[PDB]
Amino acid sequence: SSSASVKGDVIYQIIIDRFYDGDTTNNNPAKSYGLYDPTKSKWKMYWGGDLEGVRQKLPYLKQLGVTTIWLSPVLDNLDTLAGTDNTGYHGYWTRDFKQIEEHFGNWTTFDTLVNDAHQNGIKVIVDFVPNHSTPFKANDSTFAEGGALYNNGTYMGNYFDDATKGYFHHNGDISNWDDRYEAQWKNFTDPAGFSLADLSQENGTIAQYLTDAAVQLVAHGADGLRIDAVKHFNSGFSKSLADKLYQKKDIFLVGEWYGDDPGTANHLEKVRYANNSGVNVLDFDLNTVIRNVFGTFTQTMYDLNNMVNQTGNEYKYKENLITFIDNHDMSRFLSVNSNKANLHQALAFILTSRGTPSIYYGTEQYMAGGNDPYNRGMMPAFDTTTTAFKEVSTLAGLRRNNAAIQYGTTTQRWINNDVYIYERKFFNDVVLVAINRNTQSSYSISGLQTALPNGSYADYLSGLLGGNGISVSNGSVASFTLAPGAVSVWQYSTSASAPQIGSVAPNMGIPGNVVTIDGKGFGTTQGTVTFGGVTATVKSWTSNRIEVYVPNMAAGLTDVKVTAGGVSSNLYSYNILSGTQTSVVFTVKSAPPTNLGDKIYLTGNIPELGNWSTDTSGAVNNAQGPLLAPNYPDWFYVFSVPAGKTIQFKFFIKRADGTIQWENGSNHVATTPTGATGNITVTWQN
Ligand SMILES: C[C@H]1O[C@H](O[C@H]2[C@H](O)[C@@H](O)[C@@H](O[C@H]3[C@H](O)[C@@H](O)[C@H](O)O[C@@H]3CO)O[C@@H]2CO)[C@H](O)[C@@H](O)[C@@H]1N[C@H]1O[C@H](CO)[C@@H](O[C@H]2O[C@H](CO)[C@@H](O[C@H]3O[C@H](CO)[C@@H](O)[C@H](O)[C@H]3O)[C@H](O)[C@H]2O)[C@H](O)[C@H]1O
Ligand SMILES: OC[C@H]1O[C@H](O[C@H]2[C@H](O)[C@@H](O)[C@@H](O)O[C@@H]2CO)[C@H](O)[C@@H](O)[C@@H]1O
Ligand SMILES: OC[C@H]1O[C@H](O[C@H]2[C@H](O)[C@@H](O)[C@@H](O)O[C@@H]2CO)[C@H](O)[C@@H](O)[C@@H]1O
Ligand SMILES: [Ca+2]
Ligand SMILES: [Ca+2]
Ligand SMILES: [Ca+2]
Numbered sequence: 001s002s003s004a005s006v007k008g009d010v011i012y013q014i015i016i017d018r019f020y021d022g023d024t025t026n027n028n029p030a031k032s033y034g035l036y037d038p039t040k041s042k043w044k045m046y047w048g049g050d051l052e053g054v055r056q057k058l059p060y061l062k063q064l065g066v067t068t069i070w071l072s073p074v075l076d077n078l079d080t081l082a083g084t085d086n087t088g089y090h091g092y093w094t095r096d097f098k099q100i101e102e103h104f105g106n107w108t109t110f111d112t113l114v115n116d117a118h119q120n121g122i123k124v125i126v127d128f129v130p131n132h133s134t135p136f137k138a139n140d141s142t143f144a145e146g147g148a149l150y151n152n153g154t155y156m157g158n159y160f161d162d163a164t165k166g167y168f169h170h171n172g173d174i175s176n177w178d179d180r181y182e183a184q185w186k187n188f189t190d191p192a193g194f195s196l197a198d199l200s201q202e203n204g205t206i207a208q209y210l211t212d213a214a215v216q217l218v219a220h221g222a223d224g225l226r227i228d229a230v231k232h233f234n235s236g237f238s239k240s241l242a243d244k245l246y247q248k249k250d251i252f253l254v255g256e257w258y259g260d261d262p263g264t265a266n267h268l269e270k271v272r273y274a275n276n277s278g279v280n281v282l283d284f285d286l287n288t289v290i291r292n293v294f295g296t297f298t299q300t301m302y303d304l305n306n307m308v309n310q311t312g313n314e315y316k317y318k319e320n321l322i323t324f325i326d327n328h329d330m331s332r333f334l335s336v337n338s339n340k341a342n343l344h345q346a347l348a349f350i351l352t353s354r355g356t357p358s359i360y361y362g363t364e365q366y367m368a369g370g371n372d373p374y375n376r377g378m379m380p381a382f383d384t385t386t387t388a389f390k391e392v393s394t395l396a397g398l399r400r401n402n403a404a405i406q407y408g409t410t411t412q413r414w415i416n417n418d419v420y421i422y423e424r425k426f427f428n429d430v431v432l433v434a435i436n437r438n439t440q441s442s443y444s445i446s447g448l449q450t451a452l453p454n455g456s457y458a459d460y461l462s463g464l465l466g467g468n469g470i471s472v473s474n475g476s477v478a479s480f481t482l483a484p485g486a487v488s489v490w491q492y493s494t495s496a497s498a499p500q501i502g503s504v505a506p507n508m509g510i511p512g513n514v515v516t517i518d519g520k521g522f523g524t525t526q527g528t529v530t531f532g533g534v535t536a537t538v539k540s541w542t543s544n545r546i547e548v549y550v551p552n553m554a555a556g557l558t559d560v561k562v563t564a565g566g567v568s569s570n571l572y573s574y575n576i577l578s579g580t581q582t583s584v585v586f587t588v589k590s591a592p593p594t595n596l597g598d599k600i601y602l603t604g605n606i607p608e609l610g611n612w613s614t615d616t617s618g619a620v621n622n623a624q625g626p627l628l629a630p631n632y633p634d635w636f637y638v639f640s641v642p643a644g645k646t647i648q649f650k651f652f653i654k655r656a657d658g659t660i661q662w663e664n665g666s667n668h669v670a671t672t673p674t675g676a677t678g679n680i681t682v683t684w685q686n
Pocket of ligand 2: 412413414415416446447448449
């Protein structure tokens, strides 16, 4: 379906309470009375925006070029205050994952918005928050709701009556946010003075409950999810949850793994997550550099090009990275740099670069505001004539119609501290983009080379951002002047004469799942699709999109190939799992003494456990880990493995110097759980 890939889309991120109040009758419901501020002066109270308000503004969003709305969390949040004028208006403090937040509407309202968005050719992804319930104080159960969790109105439990249930972790507050055990098993804290009750995704009831809630959003039409705080709950559950969701529909998943930029201690773990979990990630690596190049001017175009190259080398599916200049957890771009030309440049960069851009609501209306909560002001106007509105609409159309933006390579063609001219190319489709961040200097551009075919090209933006026309002859662009602060875009597109795969999505699944191949040159007459040479049953076939069912074949990463008119396409990988997954805590007791830098990994006889690999790089299906060791000399971590299967595995130490020390003896043998979760505990064999 069109849900699988968002490569041709523009994502628009909406903080529901702050966008549009389409129904004033749900502003202050009796269920959660007293959390509404009609004056819009108490920044952490509900201001009244809702799901019906988003639906009423569909015409505006369509005209802007939005093709996927990312809705902030829609499920029932805390019904009380959490300290002075502080509420769950933002949606991240969930008390009931089965019900829509009453300030925003009900399930009918959600269904109506999603149905009307789809009628307007717009998809809806929902922000889903599995890490925690709501604010609590460990020493006082009367604060807020004490972390209470309900199942469609039926009480389940809170932080205080959990002794015999184990729905929450009880390990104290996070202190070191970079320590991986603390970040995942300790409580998320808020500087106001409270913690968020940390759900135990290793508890079978909670794992199935969260799975059911996510599946319910997809049953109601959602085209995918933005999964909150994926660095804060085990990554086995991310992969197992993604499995369940892809069995339901070929939706799109992206996870928020905040920060951990290149060169940092936890960076490789984030890259491995993006490459193996089945969940793509928000592009924080590029975000940092975008803000320093166009915002603070502390980095240059060389740094921006370097980060495009670095992310291009590390992320297997870099075209699934979701890019952004700002968001609801950082100051708005215009508060970093009030120059609107620099904002237009940053927007053009993400609109034409690899991956899919997410534009924070109101950027195009020139909203400004410092960090949370001042970056969550009310959408001020719906003016369709702003320069930014026009720019986004125009470039969104280019991204929908030119395959180079969706799937292309990226090649630097001209660079200095202020100017970046880069080229996207997908077979015969080419887009050359020039960006000059300096708003006071023009640059003479000579020696520019290109893959564009011969001819004269007008700026695709029609000079909106100071662009100019160019003349191309035999790969050379005639010398021209790039105006101060300008953005100029030159493009070429044509029909394909052979099958060209731009995307296969989702990137993981089991036999029988629907998978979508997006590209060009497939023809109108049905041809064939193979996975590792195995013919797949075709669900639908068009010139640019093929839907297939994953064949009942052996598990592992395999290559998808389209054959049309006897000619075969380029190959695109897809990870076939060994069956429906379960998320299992693997513990190895009494391992050998280790030194700083030494880490233990798990490996075994199925692709989920790396097929006996000892490789620990960003590759797909290699050794699993590393394990953590809060209970040293015992080590543990949580992994997604096929449910109800007998597996063989061993652990190994990867010393700081790269040396490998295997457990001795015979392989450990175990049968995995049939439910959502379970535990496999063994003793290290010396
Ligand atoms: C908000 C965000 O917090 C975490 O992110 C931290 C990250 O893990 C750290 O590494 C570090 O980031 C570095 C980064 O690595 C560097 O590359 C970069 O250069 O510098 C960064 C800044 O030093 O610090 C960030 C925090 O700045 C976490 O990992 C993220 O998942 C998280 N975002 C998402 O999670 C939540 C929770 O569901 C949402 O927040 C909601 O709940 C919060 C707590 O009640 C409310 O915010 C309060 O608490 C925050 C955390 O202590 C405070 O930062 C914030 O000022 C305060 O208002 C928040 O209003 C509410 O929305 C996020 O919206 C969601 O996107
Ligand atoms: O001519 C090919 C050459 O073009 C670009 O080099 C630019 C350079 O980026 C500018 O800073 C300035 O010095 O002009 C040069 C062109 O004369 C590419 O960046 C470079 O890779 C390529 O070889
Ligand atoms: O390479 C496949 C092989 O991997 C594992 O064998 C380990 C063995 O466990 C270690 O003790 C040491 O000898 O290195 C071997 C890898 O070269 C599995 O145990 C084995 O079943 C599997 O075939
Ligand atoms: Ca309302
Ligand atoms: Ca509520
Ligand atoms: Ca957690």
